[PDB]
Amino acid sequence: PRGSHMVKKLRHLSDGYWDSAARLGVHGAVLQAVPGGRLSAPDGRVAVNMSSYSYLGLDESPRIIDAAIAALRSNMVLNSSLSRVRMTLPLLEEAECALGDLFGADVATLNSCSAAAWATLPVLASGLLTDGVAPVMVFDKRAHFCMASLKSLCADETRVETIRHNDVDALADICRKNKRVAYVCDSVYSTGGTLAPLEELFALQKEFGLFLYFDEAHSTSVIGDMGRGYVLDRMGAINDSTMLITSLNKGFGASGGAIVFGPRDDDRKRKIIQRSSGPLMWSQRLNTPALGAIIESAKLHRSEALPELQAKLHSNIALFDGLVRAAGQGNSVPIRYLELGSEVDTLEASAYLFDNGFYVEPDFFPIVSRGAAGLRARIRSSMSTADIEQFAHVWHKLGVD
């Protein structure tokens, strides 16, 4: 109904930008992964990927890949061949128990974070997770599309309202005028260098019982003790009014996504969502290599390797912040947005850096608003001090301010 994520019908301007990005080779490239966060082209040239989302370099960990191979060798199937509602392989239960140990919460895996949003948001909107009381579903304007695109489903169940980024004052007003409210947002935003305002949100939760739904896809692993993420690091123990969705193919170094339902010893939320007609019931479970990767990555997150990787990541951020200005400086979030304010210039920049051995993803309309084009750089712990310094060199040679 009212809340919506309409398909873009006017695409002459946007198709022109996509076509140019492909023509310039910054999009549509067939590149091979190569050690050291690098990309190999058909001609043989090698570039450093500055926009990779494996923030801790776990996509290159031989431990994790070996545990994925081992899981497939011993199971000898890619997957079970029934819905998880009927049965699961012991490997799936071991993976979800290992994630539950790490996050300190009841956690289910799904084939993606997007499937996890589809499985949870309509159910949250129905009241079933809020004592039979349909909440007002309040979305942040900059919430990821995996969640925003499902507003119409949420509106089929309750009232959906979208508020301005971090408009805490407006959310409080909605809270004061309604019995039950929920806020759908991203813990770490991939643009603008912003973060979810936890202090005010937790207070509203205390005062009004505001249900908090967070997308931690850029928070898992990169932030917090044992990489539990930004929300759990501040919250400590998850409560019954907070639910988290996340991807495990980024910092965690595995594949798929997950729903952090709440307290580990309360099965009501898992029960409710597992028995609802959505992706957790009828979409394929993660295959056994992915589940092996999850188990090994979880052990690694619980060990002394995670602090070291977060250390090397915070260092590489400081090194980058000392040599290049970008949206976000000293926020300790490994995403830096190189504002260029010009679609044509962002694509030209991207094509230049790539010819110089550095790929930085070009953000243009419709990905970002018009005239707000920029290059999105992601800092990994797997970057060398040289990679970072050698890149700041080539960036200034472009002479953009």
Ligand X SMILES: Cc1ncc(COP(=O)(O)O)c(C=O)c1O
| Minimum CB distance to ligand X, residue 206 (Å) | 26
Name the one residue in this structure whose structure tokens are 């909107």. 125
CA–CA dist 322, 344 (Å, integer)? 27
The residue among 208 and 213 lying less far from ligand PGU, judged by its C-beta, is: 213
| Minimum CB distance to its own copies, residue 233 (Å) | 23
Contact with ligand PGU (CB under 6 A) among 54, 75, 88, 190:
190
CA–CA dist 125, 330 (Å, integer)? 37
Contacts of 229 (CB under 8 A, 6+ apart): 103, 187, 216, 219, 220, 221, 223, 244, 246
Contact with ligand PGU (CB under 6 A) among 77, 133, 156, 282:
282
> Binding pattern to ligand PGU, positions 85-114, x when CB under 6 A?
---------------------------xxx
Residue 78 binding its own copies, by CB under 8 A? yes
Query: Edge to edge, what strands does the sheet with 335-339 contain?
Result: 335-339, 374-378, 361-363
How many Å is the maximal CA-CA distance in the chain?
62
| Minimum CB distance to ligand PGU, residue 146 (Å) | 5
The reply to whether 284 sits in an annotated binding site is: yes
Residue 215 binding ligand PGU, by CB under 6 A? yes
Residue 339 binding ligand PGU, by CB under 6 A? no
Strands, DSSP E only, in 254-396? Answer: 257-262, 335-339, 358-359, 361-363, 374-378
Q: Which DSSP letter does residue 285 get?
A: P
| Minimum CB distance to its own copies, residue 4 (Å) | 5
The reply to whether 270 sits in an annotated binding site is: no
Length of the chain: 401
> Binding pattern to ligand PGU, positions 117-156, x when CB under 6 A?
---------------------------x-x----------
Tokens matching residue 60: 């290159």
The reply to whether 144 sits in an annotated binding site is: yes
Count the neighbouring beta carbons within 10 Å of the beta carbon of residue 218: 26
Residue 29 binding its own copies, by CB under 8 A? yes
Exposure on the CB side of residue 322, measured as CA atoms within 13 A = 9
Q: Which DSSP letter does residue 7 get?
A: P
The residue among 93 and 169 lying less far from its own copies, judged by its C-beta, is: 93
Residue 284 binding ligand PGU, by CB under 6 A? yes
The reply to whether 329 sits in an annotated binding site is: no
Name the one residue in this structure whose structure tokens are 């919460």. 105
Binding site for ligand PGU (CB under 6 A): 53, 83, 112-114, 144, 146, 186, 190, 215, 217-218, 247, 249, 257, 282-284
Binding residues: 84, 113-114, 144, 218, 247, 250, 283-284
